[PDB]
Amino acid sequence: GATIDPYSKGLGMVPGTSIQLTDAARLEWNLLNEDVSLPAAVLYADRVEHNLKWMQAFVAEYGVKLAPHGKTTMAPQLFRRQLETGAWGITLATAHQVRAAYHGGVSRVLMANQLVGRRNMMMVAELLSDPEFEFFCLVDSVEGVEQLGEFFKSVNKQLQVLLELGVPGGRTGVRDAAQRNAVLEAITRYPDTLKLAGVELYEGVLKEEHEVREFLQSAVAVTRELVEQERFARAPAVLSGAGSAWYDVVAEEFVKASETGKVEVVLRPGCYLTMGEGLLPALQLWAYVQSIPEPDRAIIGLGKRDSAFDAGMPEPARHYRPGNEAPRDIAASEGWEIFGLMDQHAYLRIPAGADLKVGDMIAFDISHPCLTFDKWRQVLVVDPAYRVTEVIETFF
Amino acid sequence: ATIDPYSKGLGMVPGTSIQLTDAARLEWNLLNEDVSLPAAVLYADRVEHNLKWMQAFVAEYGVKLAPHGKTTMAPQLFRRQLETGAWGITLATAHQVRAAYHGGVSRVLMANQLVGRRNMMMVAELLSDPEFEFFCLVDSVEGVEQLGEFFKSVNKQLQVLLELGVPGGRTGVRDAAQRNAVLEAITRYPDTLKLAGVELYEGVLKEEHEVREFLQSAVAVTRELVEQERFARAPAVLSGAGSAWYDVVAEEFVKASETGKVEVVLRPGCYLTHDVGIYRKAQTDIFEGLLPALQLWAYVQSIPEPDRAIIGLGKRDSAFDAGMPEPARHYRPGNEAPRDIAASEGWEIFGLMDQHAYLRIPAGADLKVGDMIAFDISHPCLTFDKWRQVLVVDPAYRVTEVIETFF
Ligand code: NA
């Protein structure tokens, strides 16, 4: 129960099976003392807290609240920090994810996805006898609504749904007004079970601004009509877009729905580990130099098992020789560059005669940090002296 | 070893101490929608068919195999491999060795350099088990000295294999100077490091005359060390991959395989498909074989346009290196059984996002929200690190066991 996994990678010696993650400090792991198996995933406590407090300081120019997507870390320890620093809820994608977040103390989850399949539905139904828990999922088809309605009725629960709008050539969401009206009608056939709680879209399938505005404006018109018809079962109704790349455009268009006093706008941002200019990169992967077979080629103990290829090639940022007081920063001018990532190894180009030895450590930055998280069941949190203060568990 | 109550791809797990091997008692049936989709599904009868085939193959040709476990990291599967004749399991990292040890593997060839005090300590802890045999690779004086000093300081002994490499390659000594420097360094730790043999990965090379030359060098270095009596293990181990280049390796290692001073150990990959080198290359010699044993099951979530269905399967569930998922079976809840999907149905996955996939279908397809599709993937072993728990089913789609992974 929120205990360190003694068989995971990227850890030091774990002398019991019930050592609380938050008690990791008593194990006295220090990264520089080689207490920890490399490769390891390392969050800097000072930077994580910086990024949290930075986001907390953010005063929006518009009436909008944030439900950051949790799928990139799947770490309820981080979700709780996000919620205590002002997030409205967590956006998740699967029933499995929702259960994980719920048992990690998240009390509001926007499942930005269709809920389908008997076990996925039951996994959500299991959380719905908690009167303090708030849940939403998306609907975009009559069949999907009927499946939800029949199931949740059969287990005597209520389920909040958001009508999802979509676009031609897009992903999910109703494509036109006739579909929209059929989906809305289907919901009224389960009056004691399904509860229309708002409207949702993902505007980022579109590329041009005029298309985005026109899509946002159709969502506003549908929302205002449902307000006027008193067809929402939640007060306020929720209107949600991604609002990342299109943050400004989404806010401008969605204000028109808010002006009813009956709708709250909820946006669904991504990674906090890099609203955004002052965020600091909080995660590095640390690996050993295992072999330097040629004067310009080093082999590193880091592979695709440790670092998502969709995160981008790892970039050497720090160098540390065991026995030294501290690491040193690697300057771009040194030309240390990963030119190959295999399963468990990386190829590092170095200038001939570089001061690098087998057994040295390198800390790597990665461009899209959160995408790497799913390669790590345990992520370390370190203080500025590289002492591990906490272990973060993930639920992938 | 118990079922993780918080994992994906499972049914209702009603306790925290349900043994993985007692999964059948939970009575999960895939077609009854007892299990959360997406799920990774191994077919028991196919896994067993593949193991039995490799067992029969090893008896025909006398080959010693240490199959790669790095791609599945599933000691339940490792144990079956060893029970049906594997010589040991080949692994990549100290963490993996420890997991395999914990899962009852009694011989590991770590086909990698062992570097770093915690990594070394993790291996040292296991060496207190006198029934466990371990090997790792050395390719540098610095690496040999770091191992020697560490294992001497914990009063243990370590078997190492000299790794031969090639210019522009991966690891391994490049030339005779480098080779002799590594061997000499080994001899500086006479009661700690035990030279147990010679290893290479020949498929860094692409042309055949190069591979043969490299293999020939391996045989020559081994023979030389046999004559000088530099090995501290009888027999000494000579190990090549012998998968993608199985037929060439088999020929070149002829004389080492024939002697009793040396045992040849090959390192095949995936036993969950016909697409493994040792099997593809054995066909000439052989003239029902290896079958694909894994499929990923997912729901249809939305059919928003007549030619486009959205599937609850993403890059979180299906590794890019495994290949694009291909629809293979279709099941509508309430029905007796799935149906086979042929290419002529016109279903094809055209996009895989984080948690969703795009399925092209012909307008008017026999498909509905809430149906399940089973997908084939080209390299099934390579998708295991997306799953902490993998289901095993019997022919009636009843879950008979859950397989845990150590990634
Ligand atoms: Na635990």
UniProtKB/TrEMBL annotation, chain B:
E.C. numbers: 4.3.1.18
The family note in this entry says: Belongs to the DSD1 family.
The SS bond pairs are C270-C381
Pfam families per UniProt:
Ala_racemase_N (PF01168), D-ser_dehydrat (PF14031)
- Alphabetically ordered keywords of this record: Lyase
State the top-level EC class.
Answer: lyase
**Keyword Cytoplasm attached:** no
The protein's GO terms of the molecular function aspect are: D-serine ammonia-lyase activity
Residue intervals of the D-serine dehydratase-like domain: 293-394
What is the name listed in the Swiss-Prot or TrEMBL entry for this protein? D-serine deaminase (D-serine dehydratase) protein
